[PDB]
Amino acid sequence: MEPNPNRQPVELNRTSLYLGLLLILVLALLFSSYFFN
Amino acid sequence: MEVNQLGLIATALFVLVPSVFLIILYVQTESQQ
Amino acid sequence: MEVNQLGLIATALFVLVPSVFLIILYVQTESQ
Amino acid sequence: SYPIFTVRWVAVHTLAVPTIFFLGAIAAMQFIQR
Amino acid sequence: METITYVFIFACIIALFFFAIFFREPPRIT
Amino acid sequence: GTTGERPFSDIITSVRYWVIHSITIPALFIAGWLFVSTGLAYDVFGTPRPDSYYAQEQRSIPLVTDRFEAKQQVETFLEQLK
Amino acid sequence: RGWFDILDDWLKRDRFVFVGWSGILLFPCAYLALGGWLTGTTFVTSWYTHGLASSYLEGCNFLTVAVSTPANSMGHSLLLLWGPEAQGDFTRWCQLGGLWTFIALHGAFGLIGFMLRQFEIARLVGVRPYNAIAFSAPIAVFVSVFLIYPLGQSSWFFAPSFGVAAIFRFLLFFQGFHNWTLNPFHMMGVAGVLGGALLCAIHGATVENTLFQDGEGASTFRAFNPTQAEETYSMVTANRFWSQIFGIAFSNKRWLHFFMLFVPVTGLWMSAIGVVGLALNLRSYDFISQEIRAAEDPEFETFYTKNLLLNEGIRAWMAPQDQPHENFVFPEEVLPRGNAL
Amino acid sequence: PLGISGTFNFMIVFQAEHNILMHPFHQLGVAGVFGGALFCAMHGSLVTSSLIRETTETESANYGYKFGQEEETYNIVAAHGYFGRLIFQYASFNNSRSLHFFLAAWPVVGVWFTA
Amino acid sequence: TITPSLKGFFIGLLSGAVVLGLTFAVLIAISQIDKVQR
Amino acid sequence: GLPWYRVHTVLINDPGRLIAAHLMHTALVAGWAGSMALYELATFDPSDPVLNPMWRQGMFVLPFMARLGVTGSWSGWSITGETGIDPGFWSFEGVALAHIVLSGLLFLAACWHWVYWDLELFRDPRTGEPALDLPKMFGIHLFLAGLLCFGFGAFHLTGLFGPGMWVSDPYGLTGSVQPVAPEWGPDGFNPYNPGGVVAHHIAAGIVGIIAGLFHILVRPPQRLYKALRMGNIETVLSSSIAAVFFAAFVVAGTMWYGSATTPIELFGPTRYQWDSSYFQQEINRRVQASLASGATLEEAWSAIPEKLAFYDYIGNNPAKGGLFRTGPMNKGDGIAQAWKGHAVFRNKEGEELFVRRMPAFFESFPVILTDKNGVVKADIPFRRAESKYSFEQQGVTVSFYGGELNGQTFTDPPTVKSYARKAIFGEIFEFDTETLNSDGIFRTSPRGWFTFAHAVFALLFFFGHIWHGARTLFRDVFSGIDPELSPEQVEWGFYQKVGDVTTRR
Amino acid sequence: DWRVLVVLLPVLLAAGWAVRNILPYAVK
Amino acid sequence: DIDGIREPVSGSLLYGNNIITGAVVPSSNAIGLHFYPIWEAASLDEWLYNGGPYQLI
Amino acid sequence: ARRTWLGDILRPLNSEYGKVAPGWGTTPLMAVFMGLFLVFLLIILEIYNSTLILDGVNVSWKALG
Ligand code: CLA
Ligand code: CLA
Ligand code: CLA
Ligand SMILES: C=Cc1c(C)c2cc3nc(c4c5[nH]c(cc6nc(cc1[nH]2)C(C)=C6CC)c(C)c5C(=O)[C@@H]4C(=O)OC)[C@@H](CCC(=O)OC/C=C(\C)CCC[C@H](C)CCC[C@H](C)CCCC(C)C)[C@@H]3C
Ligand SMILES: CC(C)=CCC/C(C)=C/CC/C(C)=C/CC/C(C)=C/CC/C(C)=C/CC/C(C)=C/CC/C(C)=C/CC/C(C)=C/CC/C(C)=C/CC1=CC(=O)C(C)=C(C)C1=O
Ligand SMILES: CCCCCCCCCCCCCCCC(=O)OC[C@H](COP(=O)(O)OC[C@@H](O)CO)OC(=O)CCCCCCCCCCCCCCC
Ligand SMILES: CC1=C(/C=C/C(C)=C/C=C/C(C)=C/C=C/C=C(C)/C=C/C=C(C)/C=C/C2=C(C)CCCC2(C)C)C(C)(C)CCC1
Ligand SMILES: CC1=C(/C=C/C(C)=C/C=C/C(C)=C/C=C/C=C(C)/C=C/C=C(C)/C=C/C2=C(C)CCCC2(C)C)C(C)(C)CCC1
Ligand SMILES: CCCCCCCCCCCCCCCCCC(=O)O
Ligand SMILES: [Fe+2]
Secondary structure, three states: OOOOOOOOOEEOOHHHHHHHHHHHHHHHHHHHHHHHO | OOOOOHHHHHHHHHHHHHHHHHHHHHHHHHOOO | OOOOOHHHHHHHHHHHHHHHHHHHHHHHHHOO | OOOOOOHHHHHHHHHHHHHHHHHHHHHHHOOOOO | OHHHHHHHHHHHHHHHHHHHHHOOOOOOOO | OOOOOOOHHHHOOOHHHHHHHHHHHHHHHHHHHHHHHOOHHHHHHOOOOHHHOOOOOOOOOOOOOOOOOHHHHHHHHHHOOO | OOHHHHHHHHHOEOOOOOOOOHHHHHHHHHHHHHHHHHHHHHHOOEOOOOOEOOOOOOOOOOOOOEEOOOOHHHOOOOOOOOOOOOOOOHHHHHHOOHHHHHHHHHHHHHHHHHHHHHHHHHHHHOOOOHHHHHOHHHHHHHHHHHHHHHHHOOOHHHOOOEEHHHHHHHHHHHHHHHOHHHOHHHHHHHHHHHHHHHHHHHHHHHHHHOEOOOOOOOOOOOOOOOOOOEOOEOHHHHHHHHHHHHOOOOOOHHHHHHHHHHHHHHHHHHHHHHHHHHHOOOEOOOOHHHHHHHHHOOOOOOHHHHHHHHHHHHHHHHHHHHOHHHOOOOOHHHOOOOOOO | OEEHHHHHHHHHHHHHHHOHHHOHHHHHHHHHHHHHHHHHHHHHHHHHHOEEOOOOOOOOHHHHOOOOOOEOOEOHHHHHHHHHHHOOHHHOOOOHHHHHHHHHHHHHHHHHHHO | OOOHHHHHHHHHHHHHHHHHHHHHHHHHHHHHHOOOOO | OEEHHHHHHHHOOOHHHHHHHHHHHHHHHHHHHHHHHHHHHHHOOOOOOOOOOHHHOOOOOHHHHHHHOOOEOOOOEEOOOOEOOOOOOOOHHHHHHHHHHHHHHHHHHHHHHHHOOOEHHHEOOOOOOEOOOHHHHHHHHHHHHHHHHHHHHHHHHOOOOOOOEEEOOOOOOOOEEEOOOOOOOHHHHOOOOHHHHHHHHHHHHHHHHHHHHHHHHOOOEHHHHHHOOOOOHHHHHHHHHHHHHHHHHHHHHHHHHOOOOOOHHHHOOOHHHHHOOHHHHHHHHHHHHHHHOOOOHHHHHHOOOHHHHHHOEHHHOOOOOEOOOOOOOHHHHOEEEEEEEEEEEEOOOOOEEEEOOOOOOOOOOOOEEEOOOOOEEEEOOOOOOOOOOEHHHHOOEEEEEOOOOOOOEEOOHHHHHHHHHHHOOEOEEEEEOOOOOOOOOOOOOHHHHHHHHHHHHHHHHHHHHHHHHHHHHOHHHOOOEOOOOOHHHHOOOOEOEOOOHHHEO | OHHHHHHHHHHHHHHHHHHHHHHHHHHO | OOOOOOOOOOOOHHHOOOOOOOEEOOOOOOOOOOOOOHHHOOOHHHHHHHOHHHHHO | OEOOHHHHHHHHHHOOOOOOEOOOOOHHHHHHHHHHHHHHHHHHHHHHOOOOOOOOOOOOHHHHO
8 A cells, every 4th residue: 555645844944933932931920820729 | 929830740741742743843854955 | 639830740741842853853853 | 879878877866966965053152062 | 858959950041041052052144 | 078067177167156156055054053052953863962972970971771672772871861 | 707707806895995705794893983982982971871971062171081881780680771770771871881891892803804914915916914913912912901800800890991090990900909910920020011102113113224326316115116125124234232231232133023922912811810810819928927926916018918908998998988888987986097197 | 200000190180180081192002003903903904915825834924034135025016906806906005115104104104192 | 563663674674676776777788788899 | 733723634635534524523522512511510509499400500511401301300409499300311411321331332433444444435446536525415414413413303393203392481490391282383483482393304304305416416517516626525614604504693693683493491581681671570560460459559569570570680691691700690699599579769858759670781880760751769878968869868668579678668768778779670689699609790691601701702703714725726826826927927908807828819 | 844945946947057067079 | 118118018029929919119209209229328238228229320 | 553343334434534515515504593592692692681571570589489
């Protein structure tokens, strides 16, 4: 049975990493006061 | 202060789980190069 | 049971941190 | 060779006609004494 | 414990600043 | 480009344009004025006149308080003025 | 080549104002929401629903006129002109607040109409539909603030009234009752609105100060042709400027313009979600740890405790006149006041 | 104050003492900041709407643009032709220099006033 | 049984039919007279 | 490669692995259901459904099991307080186990379907290309939905072959799983009439079967197949998402206003029952009916069931909560132990006074005592210097009828102010704050948390509707507009009709 | 009542006057 | 003591604030518009009480 | 591709991909059912809203008994 032809490589460049890391850390910084309450 | 104790594990995972996701995707992008 | 609160976070990170290390190392092996 | 009444024509007067009418009404209002 | 958490996240953001400026993917032309 | 409507700057500097609108424009102004000056606007919309917000020795708001008797409540409030 | 296609042809003609199928919904609804507001603001009182003057006719100016919400006693009645409340009397309908639902409902359907217009024109011209997508943000704000919020409360009465000062009162209601500034979803909205204005200003200025010299004259506007293929400013010099000024810059013009869509749209969607919670009085009102220490410790004061005294004042001083259906009577001696004031 | 709740304190007391909501320069500030958020989204949505096909559906459209390429990466006439028909033709720009100056000027001026 | 509010509902339903039908009669007509040429 | 936000598009033309993904999702959802119930069962106190019902203890899936007939535990208790009962296998525990077994069976199937993705069934026999006949699948699935909907109404809900559903009296005092008969009249559209729920599912079931039959046999019109891109599975996503957020808005509204499907013994009072003094009216109605037949004040109030008095208390109003005040309502005001009694305030004149109740908008509210005629006669002064109406000056006393303090009268002012403070919440209850270390701040109920989540999800899914519908109608330009779109098209007056190249002038 | 004709009359004469003045060019 | 009334307001994390409620508190009303650098205070303890850091920042 | 017993049985149900009725087909009838359905949702909405008030229909918890 042939191997699946729909696989595709996923990519995250370095700028997208920096952006997402920053989004998560600032989100964490904002919501933490509300989780400790 | 009398802060909620799961606040800490909430914050730690909130940070760690999506951060690790992005790190995983980035590193394996770079070793395709 | 009056257990330790930090026990949960100590256990969770004890699992989480080293596991993630291995996952990062394995996935980039495969994509190269 | 230009139509007079068009869609554009109706859009304008749909807006312009009651504007002036309201403007006259608000004008009279300045002269109301309590 | 909450103070350690607030200051830790702040310190991580400052560290990311450093890498994002000095260790960015360099823009290259055409 | 253009869609084939007559240009605005052509219309509003034309003589025929200002022959119509020198009548239509002031007439609408005057009609709107009279709508107020005759007091018709008060009656059409139900807006209290300066003398008809309160009964004389009265200082409570005629505030509607029932959903389905609402119409009749306004009307009872009005008879307290006549 | 039936009547449908002949009508489709006439709706989709290129004219000074495109109509489309979406204009059938948009154009009556937009006109009527707008006419209702000008009609109400010019002529219609709020004496019987609110105890307020609200028209030009009554002595109000542009900042104080409003089409106001119905009385709290109408609950969430559609307040149709032909329905059981006004019973077809146009005068009583106006007096009972009916123009508020009129405007808000024809508004809602207008906003649909407009968004469908953006889809419709984008399909006909051959461009991607991201302008419609972005417009989902204004829709979320409108429905969540004007429809979802009062539906969670007792009545339309607590929706915002359509006016300048009435909206200001809505802003201050939300501070004193909901402590809406403390709400992170609003904070993300603020960051998205202000982030938008920032990006708008900084992007216009960058383009305008990295322009290429493409004409001789001192007005640099003339040296642009809408059909030139060349970029009219230097992305390269802009990237260097901002890299050395700020430490990072944009390098991808496609990312930059997506980011300009993304930021303000997102921020609006975030504040909408917070209003949805406020519909249920699910406020971000207090920090428990603070109240616990504050209660036990009369020397502990933060800007957080200071602001709740302020909200407590707002409530007690504003509530009787803002909620007249409740007949709140607060004798002088119960009103919270600091010294001397 | 240099703090998040401290900021709210300051803006609450400012309103009690100055009725800043009813001050016209603050209203222009709102119009400056609401307006700039609007035009931010507009310009970013209109440009993004008229990107020229350069990539496939398995790839980010952003790789359609290479840093420092000489040609524009969207079609401004397709953009003008969409927005001009959304409102009417002359309520839409087609000089990119005037459009970006307008982008710069609206929020700057409104924030000058609120300042 | 046939209450005042159910009569109003029918008044609203009819009013809506007339507005939508009258609008469309007028739209169909104009489109029949002023056609595009191919 | 693919951006992170598009990894799952690899399933768009892989029907087998699309099925494996849907199986994996269905496994996760049913796994959650079983895990959530086990957690609730492990933390639920069955020992007092009067003053510690499920809705005070933060139970979220219990009430949905109860609503349809699961009422008891293998441990011997039931949620109506009946004890010594034997539910057989469809206990809370058995229902949770069934979903975990289901979860695990679904997970094995997903593995099979991910591996044997290349099933001939998914291939168009004409072209050899993978393809799903979406219009016929819709008729199949609709017909199944109609059968199930019909069966659920005809058999489960009637008790013809099932338990029925939770029904109750108007004040939430005597609820139980009961077979319900269909209401075919116009009152079957009354949200509050349980029989209309039976009729709905019988009639809608038959319409589903008839319409599914129609959609298996009748092919879509060509105009419509092209308009809606009915050969593009993403159009199904766009319309499916739209139908889902429609449904999410409905269920959030019926949860907030209340219908026959959200009884108050499973979810709690609504805020409107506080707004309109709904329980208070009935409680007063019952005390007047006692006093009428000459029952002493003590006796008339003692006849009030504590369960009805507990509804007349703002602490169970789902609109007194906060976004980050977590946990059960019990974590806030404590675990209710007893109704202390109904409190009657009088001044030195013997006039009876009334505490003005707190409305749901106010986190704090003044203490203002009024007479029958609404005239303010006592308060707790903020500024003391010009106080006229203080409890001390006005000689205010509190007397209790019913409950734990029946027949007791307090006169010393700091005590009378103390109960006067709690009286703005309505009826006065004894709470246990030590057990859960309660902090004293009201939380919302499961009625509130459900409405909030579903109102929010609905709104978000509306954007998914917009995104995925835009993606269907504009598939051809997803990657960008045509690089050879010529300016004669987008400029004015070249064509008579916009975008129609055949209408050139 | 009477104020209705008063208000309506300027606008009837206004639409009268424009109709007369434009009627030839409208028939074309 | 932001308002000069010997009523100090806690602004910092170690003193029971979170990220939302924390602030550097403005300098004392007792100072008004006066210039309050560190070297004008008799000690850093005094300078901290009266809000010196805000003026410096 | 792989053939299976169950697949061979379900085969005819996934075999008319692409097929359409001509022109407008049943579209007019669909339109009628839509319009009926809207009126119907209207009546349901306005009943719940107490804008439509029918005899013997007490839109309150007191209809539960
Ligand atoms: C397409 C444009 C449009 C849309 C979407 C709306 C939408 C609305 N209008 Mg608005 N309106 C419009 C045009 C529109 N209007 C126009 C042109 C006018 C000027 C006359 C008005 C004037 C107006 C007023 C004065 C009021 C509304 C109101 C309303 C609301 C309730 C409508 C209702 O109950 O419909 C019910 C009816 C329908 C939906 C039509 C049903 C059509 C079906 C398919 C045909 C059925 C056939 C027929 C019944 C059979 C007859 C049989 C015969 C042989 C006897 C809603 C927001 C009310 C409102 O805002 O309340 C506050 C209100 O009082 N409208
Ligand atoms: C529809 C979903 C739903 C609903 C309505 C509830 C409702 C409830 N649950 Mg359950 N629960 C759910 C799902 C749900 N649960 C799931 C999926 C799990 C597994 C994680 C659980 C696990 C669970 C446990 C373990 C417990 C409950 C409990 C409770 C009760 C208290 C809830 C509370 O305090 O929330 C607090 C709510 C919040 C703090 C809000 C969180 C949302 C944050 C603010 C947003 C996150 C930030 C986000 C990234 C924003 C940025 C986005 C932007 C970038 C685009 C309540 C009845 C409790 C209980 O009383 O048990 C008896 C309890 O102990 N639940
Ligand atoms: C059943 C509903 C459904 C389904 C099957 C899909 C499926 C899809 N979407 Mg749509 N979408 C939906 C709802 C749905 N969407 C909703 C409600 C919205 C509005 C939020 C969107 C908005 C949306 C956008 C904006 C985009 C898609 C895209 C896509 C495609 C790629 C998704 C992907 O790789 O994600 C990858 C996701 C991840 C790798 C992780 C994301 C984690 C999120 C942020 C939070 C954590 C989720 C949590 C674990 C589980 C949710 C719990 C709760 C929902 C119950 C795929 C066909 C993309 C597309 O079209 O590509 C062509 C795209 O750009 N979707
Ligand atoms: C107060 C703030 C504010 C206003 C007034 C506003 C206005 C507008 N935005 C539009 C567009 C947009 N808005 C966008 C993003 C944003 N818009 C924002 C904020 C605003 N946007 C923000 C913050 C953003 C950032 C995300 C985008 C991306 C678009 C567009 O594409 C579009 C456009 O063309 O921009 C140029 C236009 C759509 C007009 C329309 O639907 O016509 C039809 C008119 C209808 C249907 C009537 C609506 C009736 C309303 C809803 C209720 C009644 C209102 C009364 C008439 C007035 C009462 C007012 C009192 C309160 C004072 C319009 C000029
Ligand atoms: C009793 C009875 C029967 C009563 C009678 C009632 C009756 C029957 C009524 C029915 C009437 C009828 C059917 C209706 C038709 C009438 C009709 C005309 C109705 C009125 C419609 C109406 C209300 C419309 C609303 C008005 C409207 C919102 C206009 C606002 C225009 C305006 C100010 C918009 C902003 C313009 C602007 C400068 C935006 C700049 C944005 C920005 C900087 C974009 C960035 C940008 C721009 C570009 O340009 C390009 C290029 C690029 C790259 C780019 O970045
Ligand atoms: C702040 C905006 C400033 C932008 C200025 C222009 C941007 C650049 C324009 C591109 C080409 C340059 C031509 C510049 C010159 C230019 O701007 O000319 C303005 C334009 C001139 O049109 P004419 O054809 O009259 O002009 C003749 C010219 O050739 C003279 O040179 O006037 C109008 O469009 C009038 C519109 C009023 C319409 C009345 C209301 C109609 C109701 C419609 C309802 C709204 C639609 C509803 C949708 C929901
Ligand atoms: C409601 C209703 C209706 C409708 C109506 C309408 C539709 C209306 C309209 C109306 C209108 C349509 C109106 C208008 C008006 C206007 C006005 C009143 C305006 C004014 C303006 C001005 C004032 C301006 C000026 C200025 C300034 C001030 C500054 C700057 C410059 C300028 C010039 C801008 C109907 C019948 C259906 C029925 C039901 C009810
Ligand atoms: C294999 C098998 C088995 C077993 C099974 C199992 C054991 C299962 C499990 C399963 C389960 C046990 C599952 C569970 C699941 C879970 C989940 C699925 C969850 C969810 C979550 C979420 C999603 C969350 C989210 C969130 C958060 C976190 C925060 C807040 C917000 C939200 C809510 C969003 C059996 C024996 C049967 C048989 C054979 C085979
Ligand atoms: C989607 C189509 C909706 C448009 C319908 C608009 C209806 C037009 C309003 C007509 C109302 C006229 C009658 C008002 C009440 C008459 C008095 C009565 O009830 O007998
Ligand atoms: Fe740009």
